[PDB]
Amino acid sequence: PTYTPKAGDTTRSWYVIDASDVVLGRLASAAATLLRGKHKPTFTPNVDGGDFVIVINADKIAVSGDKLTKKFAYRHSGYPGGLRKRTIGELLEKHPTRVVENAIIGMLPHNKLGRQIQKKLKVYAGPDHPHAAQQPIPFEIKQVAQ
Amino acid sequence: TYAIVKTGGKQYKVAAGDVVKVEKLDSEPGASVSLPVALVVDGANVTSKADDLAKVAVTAEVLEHTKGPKIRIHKFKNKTGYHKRQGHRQQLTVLKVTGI
Amino acid sequence: ARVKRALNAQKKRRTVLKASKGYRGQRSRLYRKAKEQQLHSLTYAYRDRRARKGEFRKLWISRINAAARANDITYNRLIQGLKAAGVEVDRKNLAELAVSDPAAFTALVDVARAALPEDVNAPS
Amino acid sequence: AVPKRRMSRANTRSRRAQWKAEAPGLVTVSVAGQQRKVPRRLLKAARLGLVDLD
Amino acid sequence: AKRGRKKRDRKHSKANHGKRPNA
RNA sequence: UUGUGCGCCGAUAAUGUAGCGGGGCUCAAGCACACCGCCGAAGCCGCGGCAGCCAACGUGUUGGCUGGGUAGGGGAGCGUCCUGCAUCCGGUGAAGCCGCCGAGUGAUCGAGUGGUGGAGGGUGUGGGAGUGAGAAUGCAGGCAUGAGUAGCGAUUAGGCAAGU
RNA sequence: GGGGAUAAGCUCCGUGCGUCGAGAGGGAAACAGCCCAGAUCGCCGGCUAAGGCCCCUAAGCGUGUGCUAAGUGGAAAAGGAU
RNA sequence: UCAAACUCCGUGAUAGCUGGUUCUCCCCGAAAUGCAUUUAGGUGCAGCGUCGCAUGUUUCUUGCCGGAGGUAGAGCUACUGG
RNA sequence: GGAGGGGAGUGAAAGAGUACCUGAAACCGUGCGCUUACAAUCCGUCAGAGCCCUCGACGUGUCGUGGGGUGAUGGCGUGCCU
C-alpha cells in the first residue's frame, strides 16, 4: 500500500519571498506551489502540508505592459448595478497587499481545503515582517534546467 | 536490506519476513518459489544493472491460496432497460519472503 | 394452485435494503428508492475501479516529480534517463523510495543523470 | 399555494424541535409549616392562602 | 445574434478539428 | 512602387466582469519553422479468472479467434405453490419473522448457526401452474409531508357571590 | 445538388461516407451526431492515440533562430492608414 | 346531469388511439428505405435481424485485362440559343 | 375519580390478560458509539486522517494475509419508467 500521512507526520517551515521587482504572475505561481506543499515528496491531495509563505516588499512588484492601467479588478455587491471596478494602479496605491493576495488566491484549489491553505500565507507591504521569531528561510525563484 | 520483486506483472517491495499477496501461482502450499528482482538495496548501496539483478533472486514460501474481496457488478443504462449482473472473486496466493 | 407472492418477493427486498444501509434519508429505508440507488452505486463503483488505477498512478508521479526536483532533475528527464539506463522500477516503488528512504532515490537519480545524452536537444 | 415537495426528515425535525415549552421558575414557600414550591409570581398570594396547593 | 455566432465559432477549436454537431 | 509575415481603425445593448474556463502571461505562459522528453483512455502489452465458435487429439484437456448493445431471435437456469413415487428431519421444537458468520458467474444459497415461535417440513426424480410488480392520474388497508399550521360556523355581551 | 435570398439548428435528394439512434472510456470548460478509441472480469504494473506539459491540473516559467506592442493571442465586413 | 333523463340488460360494446405487462445469465442483432394503399402517426409485400436445413468461398479486398457512358473540365465558322 | 398499571396468583407459557396465535414494513420514540454551526451536497462512489468495538500474536501497549460502525478532507458524478 502507498504511504499516506498519519496524525503527526506533517511538518511546517517558514519561507519569505522578496516580492521586489518580481513579475506578479511568476511570484504567485511560486507561492501557490509552496502553499500547497507540492515541493515535498510526501504530497497528498487531501492533506495539506504546505509551508507558511511570507511575502515581503509586496508593493514594489512589477507588472508588465499596460496592465497597470488597463487591467481591472471587478467586484459585485449583489445589489442591482453594484459592479464596481478598480484598475490595478489604483488597487496598488490604496492597499498594495491585495494585488498579490488575489493573484495567489486564484491559483489555489477553490474547495474547502484551499480555504484552509490561505491561513498559511502572510503578505506584507513593507520590507519588514513581524514573524522574525519563526525564522523564515529566505526563498528565491529558480528553474531546474532540463 | 530490501528488494523489489517482479511477479504477476507487478513489482512488490519486500524484505526478509514480509507477507505479500500476489496473483495465483502453480505451487502447492508449503512449497518454496524463486522470483526475479527489479532492484536491491543493501544498506547504502543500490544494485540496478540488469546483469547483477539476473544473478540474484528472491526466495519465498507459499503460505496458502486465498480469494479476494467479492466484486458485484451491475451494469446499467437508463431509458433502455439494460441490466447485467455478474460477480467476481480473484484467486490470490500469499507468500512469505524468507531470504534474498 | 394460487400462489401468494410474499415468500418469493420478500427475498430481493432484504438484499437491497441490507446492502443499502448507511445511506442518507429515504435511500436507506424504502426498497423502491433504495433500488434506485443501488443502480447508481454499482455503476459508480465499476467506473471508479477503472479510474482508481489511473488516479493512483498519478499520485505517484506527483511524489516522484517533487523528489526529482529536489535533486535538481525534471521528472520527464528522470524517466528518460531511467529507461535508457536499464532501470525498470515502476512508478509505485519509485514513489515509495522517494518518500521512505531518500538515500536510494538519490542513487537512482545519479544513474539517470549519467545515462542521459550529452545534449538532450540533439536531433539524435 | 400548496407544498410542492415532501419535506425531508432533516427539515421536518429541525423546525419541529422549536415547538417546545419552558419550565416555570419555582421558589420555595412555607405554608402552614410545610415547604412547597410556587412560582415567584404567585408568591404573595400563597402566603395569604389564595393559592390552592394540592 | 450574439449566441448564434459564438456557437459556430467554437467549432474552430483544436480538439474539434473544424467540425461540430449542429454546426 | 511590387510581393509577402505579424499588427491598428472600421467595432456597436439591455441582471454581473462576460468574445481565454479562471488566475495570470509580452522576464510569453503569443505566433512560424526544426529538435528533445514526458503526461494521457475501459485502446495495446503483462499476470490471473470466466464464457461462445472452431481445431488438435482424447475417453475433456490444450490451443487459436471472439465476448458493447435497444426493438428482436435462439440456448440454459434461480425462486414460489399443488401433486406421483422414494427417502430423511420435527414438542429433545417444523414453518414463519429478526440477527451473526459466510457462499455462488446471476436469479439467489446456508441439512451453518443465535433469538422469537409452536406443528408441520427437506431432498431426488417426474406431472401441473391463479408462479416472480416500481410505475397503469391502477384497487383495498395502514401511515407520513403540509402541521401542532388553517379553522372552531355571523351581524346580541357578558359579569360577580355561593354550591355540587 | 434542387427549393430559399446560393438564410436558417430549414426542407427534399445521392454516397460499400461516419457517428448518434442502439455506445461506455479520453479530448472539445460544461456540450447524443465533432476528434481519438468499440467496455468479458480483476490488478496500488507498463507503452501510446486525439489533446496537452506556469498554478488550478497530470506532464516543459524545454532548446535554437526569428516576428508581435495590439492583451493581437483570447470574434467580423466594404474600406482608411508614413 | 339534458342538442334527447336515470337504472338494469346486449356487455368484458368497439377504438388505425394513450397508458400498463412482473426473475437471471450466455450468443447473435437490426430499421426509420422501395412499391401500393379511403393512404400518409395504420397495414401488405420487398429490403435489413435471428434459428434450422442445404450448398460450400461462390461473398469481400487488391493487381491485371475486356467493356459502355457523358458528369467535372473545356469548346463553339462544330449545332441551338445568348 | 376512573382508565390504566405494580406486586401476588392461575397457567407449560401472561414475549397467550377477553385491545388476546404467529406479529413483518411504512410511521413514531427512548438509550448508547462516531460525526456535524465558513458552508453550494441527484445525497453516492474511489482514496482517506481521527475516534469507538471486536479476533489473534506479542506486555504495561503494539502489529496483523485481520473484521466491523462512524466518517474530517480530496477526485469523479445530470433521479427511475414511458
Task: Report the alpha-carbon distance of residue A13 to residue A52 in Å, rounded.
Answer: 6
Q: Experimental method for this entry?
A: cryo-EM
C33 residue type, one letter: K
Phi first, then psi, for residue A115 (nearest 5°) are -75, -30
| Nucleotides of strand G under 7 angstroms from a protein beta carbon | 8-9, 22-30, 32-35, 39-47, 50-63, 69-71, 75
Question: Measured between alpha carbons, how far is residue A101 from residues A19, A22, A38, A142 in Å?
Answer: 12, 14, 19, 21
What is the spatial distance between Cα C77 and Cα C92, in angstroms, rounded to a whole number?
18
Give nearest nucleotide to C66 (CA–C1'): G59
Residue C100, min C-alpha distance to chain B (Å)? 12
**In the block, residue with C-alpha cell 516529480:** C65
Cβ-defined contact of C69 to A39 (cutoff 8 Å): yes
Q: How many other CB atoms sit within 10 Å of the CB of residue A129?
A: 17
Resolution (A): 3.6
**Between the CA of B67 and the C1' of G52, what is the distance in angstroms?**
41
**CB-closest option in A2, A3, A41 to C66:** A41
On whether the CB atoms of residues A33 and A49 are closer than 8 A, the answer is no
Cβ atoms of A122 and A14 closer than 8 Å: no
- Cα separation of A117 and A124, whole Å? 17
Chain C residues with at least one Cβ partner in B under 8 Å: 38-39, 42-43, 46, 49, 85-90, 92-93, 96, 101, 103-104, 107-108, 111
Nearest to C39, CA basis, from A94, B85, A75 = B85
Length of chain C: 124
> For chain A, how many structural domains are there in total?
1
Of C55, C56, C78, C58, residue with least CA distance to C67: C78
Asked if residues D29 and D47 have their Cβ atoms less than 8 Å apart, the reply is yes
Contact map slice: B 66-95 vs C, CB within 8 A: 71-76
Q: In sequence order, which residues have a C-beta less than 8 Å from that of residue A126 and are 6 or more positions away?
A: A56, A57
At a 7 A CB cut-off, the residues bordering strand H are B 83-86
Which positions in chain D touch C25 (Cβ < 8 Å)? 8-10
In what helix (H) or strand (E) does residue C57 lie, and over which residues does it extend? helix C31-70
Structural domain harbouring A30: 1-146
Helices (H), chain A: 24-35, 67-70, 88-94, 97-105, 112-117
d(CA C17, CA E1): 53
Q: How far apart are CA A97 and CA B79, in angstroms?
A: 55
Going by C-alpha positions, the residue among C81, C86, C57 that lies closest to residue A146 is: C81
